Amino acid sequence: MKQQEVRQRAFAMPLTSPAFPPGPYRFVNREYMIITYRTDPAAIEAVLPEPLQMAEPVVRYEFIRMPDSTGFGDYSESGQVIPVTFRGERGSYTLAMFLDDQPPLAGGRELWGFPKKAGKPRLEVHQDTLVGSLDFGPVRIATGTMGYKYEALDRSALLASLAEPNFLLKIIPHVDGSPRICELVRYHTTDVAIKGAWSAPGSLELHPHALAPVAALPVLEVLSARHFVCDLTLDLGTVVFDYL
Amino acid sequence: MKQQEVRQRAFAMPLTSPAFPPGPYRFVNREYMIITYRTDPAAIEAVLPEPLQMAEPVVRYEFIRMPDSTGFGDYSESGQVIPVTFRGERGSYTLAMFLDDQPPLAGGRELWGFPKKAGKPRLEVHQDTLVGSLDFGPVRIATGTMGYKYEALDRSALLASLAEPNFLLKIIPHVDGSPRICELVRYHTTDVAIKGAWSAPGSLELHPHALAPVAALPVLEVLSARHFVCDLTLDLGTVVFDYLR
Amino acid sequence: MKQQEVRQRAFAMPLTSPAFPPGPYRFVNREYMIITYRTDPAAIEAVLPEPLQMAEPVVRYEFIRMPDSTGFGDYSESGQVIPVTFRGERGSYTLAMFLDDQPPLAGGRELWGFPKKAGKPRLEVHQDTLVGSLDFGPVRIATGTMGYKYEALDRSALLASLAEPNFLLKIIPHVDGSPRICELVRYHTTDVAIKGAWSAPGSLELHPHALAPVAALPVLEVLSARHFVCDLTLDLGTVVFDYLR
Amino acid sequence: MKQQEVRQRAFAMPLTSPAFPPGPYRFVNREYMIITYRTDPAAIEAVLPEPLQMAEPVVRYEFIRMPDSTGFGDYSESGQVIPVTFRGERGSYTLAMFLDDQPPLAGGRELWGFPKKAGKPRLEVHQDTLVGSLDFGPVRIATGTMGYKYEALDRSALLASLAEPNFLLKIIPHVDGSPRICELVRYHTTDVAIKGAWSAPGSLELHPHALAPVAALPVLEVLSARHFVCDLTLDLGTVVFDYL
Amino acid sequence: MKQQEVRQRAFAMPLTSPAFPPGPYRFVNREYMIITYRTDPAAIEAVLPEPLQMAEPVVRYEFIRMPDSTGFGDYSESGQVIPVTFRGERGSYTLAMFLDDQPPLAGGRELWGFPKKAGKPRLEVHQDTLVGSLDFGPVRIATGTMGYKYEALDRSALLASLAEPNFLLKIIPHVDGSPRICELVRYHTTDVAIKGAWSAPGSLELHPHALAPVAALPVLEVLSARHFVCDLTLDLGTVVFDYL
Amino acid sequence: MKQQEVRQRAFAMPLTSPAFPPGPYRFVNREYMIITYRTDPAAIEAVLPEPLQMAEPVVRYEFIRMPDSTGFGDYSESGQVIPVTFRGERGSYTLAMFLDDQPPLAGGRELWGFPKKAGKPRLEVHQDTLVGSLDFGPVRIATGTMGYKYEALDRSALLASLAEPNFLLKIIPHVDGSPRICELVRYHTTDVAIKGAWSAPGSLELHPHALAPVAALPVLEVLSARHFVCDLTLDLGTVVFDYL
What we know:
Chains B, C: Belongs to the ADC family. Chain A is mostly beta strands.
């Protein structure tokens, strides 16, 4: 509690009982429903921050169950991710995520710079159908469906996809409201072990919301639906571009 | 979207739909129940970061209703504040807070460096008693009671505290886990219009929790209780010590 | 604790934690629905204690919301008031009241000698109708209705009644059952700020009950209905006749 | 309704339909759980009104079911009572009681001067355990437990205890707020018929409350627990000391 | 059925349909939350039977889920365990245990001498917190919490802890009420496989109860908390000291 | 807590807070519904342990409410009882019993050797019918019905069946699984006061269950139904035949 021990001990607020712990952040049996859809290219351009370059005019809309996550607990996630290139390198940009557990929400924002907001994601099998849903308070803003494990998915393509760089725009205001942090961050998921992976026919419907504008990239054509279960490690990011 | 527009628009993540808006953050009919209690001085020193210095060994345990908040909505808060001095100026230090609404939560942390976690605070009149509760998941970690408006409080004497400085240790990790922001912040509540203020007898019980350790400052005796309602602006804060200079 | 301190501290039981606190008893946004009805004059004389004298043969049946009361909390009341004169001064006599909160109940009785019993009064707007109800245990003993704010009322004319004296027969047994306190009390509501007042059509039905005999003054015809909201102080009362002099 | 008939008829408010009737107050099958505990002697001294003298630094914490009570009905009670002497005579002082029925609450206060407040007492057998509880609105302020009828209790000691004088500080304000009544009252329970009486291991926990400060005499050590069922008559009090 | 068949078939009551079966008792995915706290040494000395010897003034308070238990079914346990020495060997003494399933309750008492009573133990993750509770009828008697999986635990230390002897005082009355069995019993859990093991911050609160007096070992200071999942076999015990 | 205290204190586990107290075990307003049915004689001989001998081929199927039981609490029982001779003397053998309260279940098994298992017995009047039911988990295994108090029953004859010896086969395993106790126990209900006794038409239906096999003694023909209320003392039993 001397000034030097404060510098040394500081990690997250509150100092003496921080809102989230340090890693490694290990995920066991995270379960993904991802519905990939073609959207209006004009709508991607309108939200994409340079130096990031646009790729195919597609959105990957995700529902993730994370029943066993070190330091964070048991939670679910929904999100919009978009394919991009940075220095001609191919990866992903996360536009929006929604979580129902606070430690991964604060940790996500403050540490990597995931653009997390609060919401009620669910991902469940109802007899014959895998149903993904997202509510923001009392308003349903996303409903995804897939058939159940119709065909095995190619592990190669999947593992190569999970290996790609993931980019995020970390912004943190200074006490005065002006940006104190404002960088592009690259992170990876590593030690990936697939437990199973499948495709099936899929569907997505999005709904408008003032505070959760997923509907701003409209579902013109659903292209594919993938469902998979894996263990992985969410590695710390590194800054690849600093706006300041 | 060119990289100069990115730098202009940037306030909070996500860039194009921020988790919370800029102020001013106005508060109408903000309602307080504050229970002051004498605790173990050793427990206070364990948690107080220098150059902050300890005053009287008391905790002000608070429950707050905020039904009307610009940009944040309608929410409640409970938390633990202690009397402090910095450079021999008297003020408060916020040790822990707990809210049931996300924008004020992210906002609180990312902007001022309020030490916010999620919780279920309640403050409700039950016939003759004003009851403050805090639950953390299924566990009750704080229960406070007061009589209802027994004695009108010296209002002029109240604004005596509502004008003094509030200190916070703002900490934000860098991507690698080492601190990127680590500073003491001084903020003020300004524009304070008191609608009523009262004292009455009071009680408090706190329960242990691994992730909400309010009970760590133990309730040795209750000293006072106050209930008040007001309008108020939460002004943006200032750095008054930067640990990473 | 010496017997002089006992005599100084003594206000209400229990000595060290009284069932209700001293005033002033301030009331904010006190809301009234009052249904006035013509009853059998004989029924009024059966229950009116001399030297009180009967005026017009009417009952003002009231339902009152008191969401903000110093020392008492948040409660409701329903009861039966009659026009009276004492020494040719016009005022009211309270025949029966019913409350859902204990401190105002003990307070009411022990201090002023309000004739309070326990009950479940409600006063709520249901779309187009203002509905007053009183239940005594599982039994509905009073239902009142009004239209909603049809005609604004002459406010100056209203304070005409809110300034006149209210009489109560205060009775407290001695330990042996014979009366130790038995007096007529005059109290006033002062500091009265009316926020709104209205009239509309009205109805009333009352049902028998062995222990809540409101129906004993039967509803022969409804004469008027009024609805109003106000701030108000219930001043401490005065003895104006002592039956045990 | 002439002034003379008012004097004659007056008993309790309201005059013509009084809030509680006159006696005799007869109790059939009242059922007691009493947990006796040692407390801080300093805490008794702080609430004890002289001429009353302190005795052993113990509190008897009671839960009473009264299913059949003349003039009052069917109700439950919880309370703190403390052993005292008055003129070297041994008996009891009632610090706090809580009831869930209005006639015995008004009657109790106005007639004997029991220090009654409102609350939700319960006393119930749950399989193997006698559970006493007290709530004050939404806050539990007392929880007592006992085993079920482990051993028969000595009737002698019990009957001698129920025969002891019971003292109360009756206070009633005058219309102006200053004491109009302020006396020590002595009353007895008579025509006592025990139907059964037992002991077992017992427990008590108290919780703080601004308006119901039972916790102000802390449970240092539980000394005993007694459970008993009896008929009795609650006799009128007599004033043994008048402060005015 | 002849007298000889009776002895040959006799295992547990009822003879022809025993309340629990013979082993081996195998456990799959046993999940533990153990909070270790410092207590009053005099409070342990009050309850530890010689020839057992006290070690540290420490209590290991446990919440255990047993979803898959051969012979017994699917149940939960909460218990209070004291480090002891006996004949130069470090071990544990089981003071109290509470279970929500009858065959392992009768089985544990009558076979090993586990000190078991009935209760409602729970152990569940609520978002970011692991929460352990025990109710005895309507009364909460224990609440424990841990962070979720903050850091990995030394698996070698854990296995050595699961290898130490576990001592129980088995008592069974004769028909006349005098002891027919009164003996110290030693048992082990063997064939142990750790599926995972973590530490994190922890808390415990205990409440008094007349029939489940876990609160008689007060929580002066919480020392550690551990959370693990394992398979094991509860082996039959052996007598190590016969009091008769 | 010394060695020689251990064998003086020791009655039931846990040593310091036993699962059930010593007696006398006193029952007030024990209410019985007994349906007597003729069964397959071969089914009785299959379960009857020599030196016990079969009498009439009947079963007495019981539903018992025990609202007031010293040391045990308030609970219900259902069970199967057969007439028997031992050494030419007429008594009963208890085949099977089910209780909803732990202290009397442990106490019954460990002390007398009643063949007690957990279940949910109920006995209640529904308008015109006395209905006894027994559930074992989600499964109904016994439903009995009687008319309500059709004719007063000869008490002097009743009181006699209540003086007959009751025999039990007490079995307790040793820590190694071999029988440590295996004996016929004789016990009596004494100090009996019949408060009323009645007969009426009756019915009984039984359903199979793997772990509660009452249906193994099939209901061939219902012979009689009896309903009665009483106070009694369950005396400690005596060993009348030790298999070991």
